Design an enzyme around this catalytic site. Structure first.
Site, mmCIF file in Angstrom:
data_model
loop_
_atom_site.group_PDB
_atom_site.id
_atom_site.type_symbol
_atom_site.label_atom_id
_atom_site.label_comp_id
_atom_site.label_asym_id
_atom_site.label_seq_id
_atom_site.Cartn_x
_atom_site.Cartn_y
_atom_site.Cartn_z
ATOM 1 N N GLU A 71 0.770 -1.223 0.000
ATOM 2 C CA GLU A 71 0.000 0.000 0.000
ATOM 3 C C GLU A 71 0.806 1.281 0.000
ATOM 4 O O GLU A 71 0.949 1.937 1.036
ATOM 5 C CB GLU A 71 -0.889 0.094 1.274
ATOM 6 C CG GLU A 71 -2.197 -0.675 1.093
ATOM 7 C CD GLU A 71 -3.113 -0.566 2.303
ATOM 8 O OE1 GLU A 71 -2.772 0.160 3.244
ATOM 9 O OE2 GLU A 71 -4.172 -1.208 2.256
ATOM 10 N N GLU A 90 -6.755 -6.723 -0.514
ATOM 11 C CA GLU A 90 -6.969 -6.481 0.902
ATOM 12 C C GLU A 90 -8.209 -5.614 1.129
ATOM 13 O O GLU A 90 -8.307 -4.577 0.473
ATOM 14 C CB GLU A 90 -5.749 -5.776 1.518
ATOM 15 C CG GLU A 90 -5.817 -5.766 3.041
ATOM 16 C CD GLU A 90 -4.697 -4.912 3.625
ATOM 17 O OE1 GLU A 90 -3.518 -5.279 3.523
ATOM 18 O OE2 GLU A 90 -5.054 -3.858 4.181
HETATM 19 CA CA LIG Z 1 -4.868 -1.582 4.481
#
Ligand SMILES: [Ca+2]
Ligand SMILES: [Ca+2]
Ligand SMILES: [Ca+2]
Ligand SMILES: [Ca+2]
Ligand SMILES: [Ca+2]
Ligand SMILES: [Ca+2]
Length: 302
Positions: free
Chosen positions: A136, A225
Site C-alpha cells: 500500500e 486487501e
Molecule cells: Ca490496508
C-alpha cells in the site's frame, strides 16, 4: 483441486482467467503481519480455511517495516511455510511485500528485488504463486508516475527473469485506492493486476466508481486487501456496506482477500482472542467479521 482445476492463471483483457481461458474468481484470507501473528499461518489452519471456509487463495502479509523483514528477515521462513502449504493444499498463494509505514516502495527497492529474485527462483514454476510487490503505497508525495510505476518497472523484470508468466499485483496510490491513475498509465507486462483496497465502514460509491473507471480502461484489478470495519476502527463492523461491496465484486468477478486472519482485538480481525492457531474453530471463535466473511466464501464455493 483448486490449482489442479485452474492451473496457470493469466490476464485476458483485464480479466483473471485460468489455463482454459475461463474466468476465475479467487476469494480468501490475508494473514495479519507475520511478525506478530504468524502462528495462524500454517498447514493445518490453511487446510481448515480451504476445507471449512472454501478459500482458494491465501495472502501471506510480510511486513517490511514494524519488526518485519527489513529488521528480521527470519519472517521469510514463515512465508516459505505458507507457500509450501499452499502448494501441498493445491490453492493459490500471494506473497505480499507489505509496505505501509515505509510509504514509498522505493525505500527498500534493493531489498525487494533481492527478495523477489529469491522467491521467483524457488517457486516460479508453480502456478499457485502470485507476487504482490508493494502492498500500500501512500502519502501525497508517492504517486504512480514518479514512484510506483518506475519501482514496478524495476522489480517485474527481476521476477520475469525467473518466472515469465505468474501474476504480479502492483499497489497504487493513496493506500492502493488510486487505480484510476494507474489505469491511465498502465504497465506493459501482460500478467499484471493493480491493487484496490477498501474499508466497508469508510469507502462507498465514489470508490466503486473509481474502480469502474479503471476497469473501463482495460486494467485488471485485484482487491488484495479489504476490511469490514471503518478505517478508524471504531463503531464495530459494517456488513451492510460490506455486502454492497461483495455484490459489486461478484458482478465484476473481482478476486479478493479479506483482512485479516488474527485474534487481535480489532473489528476487522476474523478471530476472537485465544482462537486456536491451527484452525478447527468453533463459531464462538469467529468474530462477526469472521462469521460474515466465512459465509461469503462458503456461499460461493464448490
Ligand atoms: Ca490496508
Ligand atoms: Ca507441522
Ligand atoms: Ca537470481
Ligand atoms: Ca511461472
Ligand atoms: Ca531505477
Ligand atoms: Ca463468477
Amino acid at each position: 483441486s483448486v490449482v489442479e482445476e485452474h492451473g496457470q492463471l493469466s490476464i485476458s483483457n483485464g480479466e483473471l482467467v485460468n489455463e482454459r481461458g475461463e474466468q476465475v474468481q479467487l476469494k480468501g484470507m490475508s494473514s495479519h503481519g507475520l511478525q506478530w501473528y504468524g502462528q495462524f499461518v500454517n498447514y493445518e489452519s490453511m487446510k481448515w480455511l480451504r476445507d471449512d471456509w472454501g478459500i482458494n487463495v491465501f495472502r501471506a502479509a510480510m511486513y517490511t517495516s514494524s519488526g518485519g523483514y527489513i529488521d528480521d528477515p527470519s519472517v521469510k521462513e514463515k512465508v516459505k511455510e505458507a507457500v509450501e502449504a499452499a502448494i501441498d493444499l493445491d490453492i493459490y498463494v500471494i506473497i505480499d511485500w507489505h509496505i505501509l509505514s515505509d510509504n514509498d516502495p522505493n525505500i527498500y527497492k534493493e531489498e525487494a528485488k533481492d527478495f523477489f529474485d529469491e522467491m521467483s527462483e524457488l517457486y516460479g514454476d508453480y502456478p499457485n504463486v502470485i507476487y504482490e510487490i508493494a502492498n500500500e503505497p501512500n502519502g501525497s508525495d508517492v504517486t504512480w508516475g514518479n514512484q510506483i510505476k518506475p519501482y514496478a518497472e524495476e522489480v517485474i523484470p527481476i521476477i520475469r527473469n525467473n518466472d515469465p508468466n505468474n501474476i504480479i499485483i502492483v499497489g497504487t496510490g493513496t493506500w492502493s485506492q488510486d487505480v484510476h491513475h494507474a489505469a491511465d498509465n498502465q504497465l506493459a507486462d501482460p500478467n499484471v493486476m493493480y491493487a484496490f483496497h477498501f474499508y466497508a465502514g469508510t469507502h462507498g460509491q465514489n470508490l466503486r466508481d473509481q474502480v469502474d473507471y479503471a476497469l473501463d480502461q482495460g486494467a485488471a484489478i485485484f482487491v488484495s486487501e479489504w476490511g469490514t470495519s471503518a478505517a478508524t476502527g471504531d463503531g464495530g463492523v459494517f456488513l451492510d456496506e460490506a455486502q454492497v461491496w461483495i455484490d459489486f465484486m461478484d458482478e465484476r468477478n473481482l478476486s479478493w482477500a479479506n483482512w485479516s486472519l488474527t485474534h487481535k482485538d480489532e473489528s476487522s480481525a476474523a478471530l476472537m482472542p485465544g482462537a486456536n492457531p491451527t484452525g478447527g474453530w468453533t463459531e464462538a471463535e469467529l468474530s462477526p467479521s469472521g462469521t460474515f466473511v466465512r459465509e461469503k466464501i462458503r456461499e460461493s464455493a464448490s
